[PDB]
Design a protein around this ligand. Structure first.
Ligand SMILES: Nc1ncnc2c1ncn2[C@@H]1O[C@H](COP(=O)(O)OP(=O)(O)O)[C@@H](O)[C@H]1O
Ligand SMILES: Nc1ncnc2c1ncn2[C@@H]1O[C@H](COP(=O)(O)OP(=O)(O)O)[C@@H](O)[C@H]1O
Ligand code: NA
Ligand code: NA
Lengths: 315, 320
């Protein structure tokens, strides 16, 4: 029976409501404060658990993050490997929400970057780039050098440097999940002329399909890595290694788009869970799209992620 | 001549210093290089410095239970905390401060318990001096000034308008009830601008700053929106201070020469305000109060942190 390990981040997002973005030398009083749990690790782990899979999160928070740990636990995330680091704070995004509409963000890595694991009980590894890359590399290498090798899924967010991308051990990767702009960052770092980030909507699907094939056949990459490219409201592109590139449209929404926050983390978590359930690849993707549809119809990051029953009720 | 006792009506903050390359610009995302969390708040900082300077002081305000370690830090320094309430289901006020490598800082305040006002709505019976800022609700600051000014005899009340009040609030402010206004050059400009002046002492060049601030003080003194009984202190950072006693000349004193490199200038203004009130409380002459303030502030900027860099009176005496 399948079990996923997420090696990734936990963030508290702090929205300070302000008349205007604070200027240098200025003291200004916020008129309200909203907190939202986040982080690519925590979001995607939450989605895996909401989709019904057994998942554990490997990372660190501060004492100020226990309420997020409890939120993950309540959703079924294993948090036994979620360490509390004294004298560090949970990763933080300090967001200034101005009445001008203009926003400004300050990111603080915090306990996500704390650097002081047997993978034998795990079948899947989920990683991103919001913890130290050495940690992600070490976990990815360990998944690939296991007997048998673990199914590993990588979401390069935030994007790695061109130097980091070219020296990345892609041979150890079962799945790469990106959006069209992140696909363009990889192709650009690998000498490609095309960047499907600046594509027009009419060209997007075809140019991103071509970018997937080109990345597959690029010397810096590996030919054994499956590639999923998410396209927001246009859907997803999927390349199974050695098959043909498939397009699936986004699920038809039953409600207005409220908020697209967490849509890609919702996809990643539901995808790993679909792999763990032994479903066909296409059926795992279909469940992702329906889950992501519910996700963009609801407010919040984690809070918007539907339960499998909710996904099945729509299906 | 009675024993001096100071009531500080003001804020307690948990300060979060995010170390950044520059102050974040609208639309930009930027990563901090480090975070320092420390006790702060204008009320707590200034009350702390009064206690360090040897004065009898009590802080009147509110924290949340997440702030009890700040309350204990104040008690250890000799700040009286019986009137620092702990409000259930409330968090201590916060300052989110961008500390740029450039040098400039930017502060976002979250009021938290600092804006707790019991319903319904205090005696000033044993107090001679009242110190107030603007990090609690203005009605509370005003009610305390009214009470200080309506005592017999009236309390010596000192005001540091931080953060700056709105133009309307400044024009209806009871300046007649104030003994001392403590400001920096930028704040001096805010009052002047709110009172119909064209003078902009903050926007002056470094070569002319002392002269432009000196005139701005004399202009503020003579303004019909202000009051002629209020003494004015304008701090000028590394350039020193300006002092104005009503009807006298504006006096300039330079900053103390440092005996160690600059480590951190945060809290120097609050260190000054607290030492100034304590100097008044001791019955020292005004020049000796200011001279002690300057030496205290020289020590302050040689050390890290806001409260923790404030020297004890004995430490200041070793330099004098
Ligand atoms: N506007 C939208 N309408 C419908 N579905 C959406 C919308 N935005 C996102 N989704 C769904 O969520 C998935 C992931 O969204 P996407 O924007 O590509 O993620 P990312 O945050 O990585 O950019 C999409 O492939 C789609 O199924
Ligand atoms: N860079 C500095 N070098 C030396 N003394 C300083 C420096 N900055 C501040 N001080 C001392 O601290 C006092 C108050 O600092 P200032 O910057 O004017 O306060 P505020 O934070 O209220 O603007 C100054 O008058 C001076 O005596
Ligand atoms: Na998108
Ligand atoms: Na200054």
């Amino acid at each position: 029976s399948s079990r996923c390990l997420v090696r990734g981040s936990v963030n508290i997002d702090e929205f300070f409501h302000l008349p205007h973005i604070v200027r240098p030398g200025e003291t200004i009083s916020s008129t309200g404060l909203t907190k939202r749990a986040g982080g690519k690790g925590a979001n995607q782990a939450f989605a895996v658990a909401r989709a019904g899979g057994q998942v554990e999160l490997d990372g660190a928070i501060g004492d100020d993050g226990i309420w997020v740990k409890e939120m993950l636990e309540s959703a079924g995330v294993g948090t036994d490997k979620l360490k509390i680091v004294k004298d560090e704070v949970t990763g933080r995004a300090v967001i200034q929400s101005a009445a001008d509409g203009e926003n400004s963000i300050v990111l603080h890595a915090g306990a996500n970057y704390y650097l002081p694991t047997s993978l034998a009980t795990y079948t899947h590894l989920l990683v991103q780039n919001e913890v130290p890359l050495s940690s992600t590399l070490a976990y990815l290498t360990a998944a690939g050098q296991s007997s048998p090798p673990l199914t590993s899924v990588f979401n390069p967010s935030p994007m790695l440097t061109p130097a980091q991308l070219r020296e990345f051990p892609w041979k150890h990767l079962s799945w790469l999940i990106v959006n069209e702009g992140e696909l363009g960052d990889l192709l650009l770092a690998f000498g490609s002329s095309a960047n499907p980030g600046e594509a027009k909507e009419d060209e997007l699907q075809a140019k991103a399909s071509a970018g997937i094939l080109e990345l597959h056949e690029n010397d810096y990459f590996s030919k054994n890595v499956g590639i999923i490219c998410t396209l927001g409201a246009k859907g997803i592109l999927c390349y199974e290694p050695g098959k043909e590139v498939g397009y699936l449209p986004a699920a038809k929404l039953q409600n207005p788009v409220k908020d697209t926050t967490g849509a890609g983390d919702c996809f990643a978590g539901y995808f790993v869970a679909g792999l763990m359930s032994g479903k066909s690849l296409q059926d795992a993707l279909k469940t992702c799209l329906v889950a992501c549809g519910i996700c963009v119809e609801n407010e919040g990051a984690m809070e918007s992620v539907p339960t499998l029953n909710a996904v099945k009720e729509r299906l």
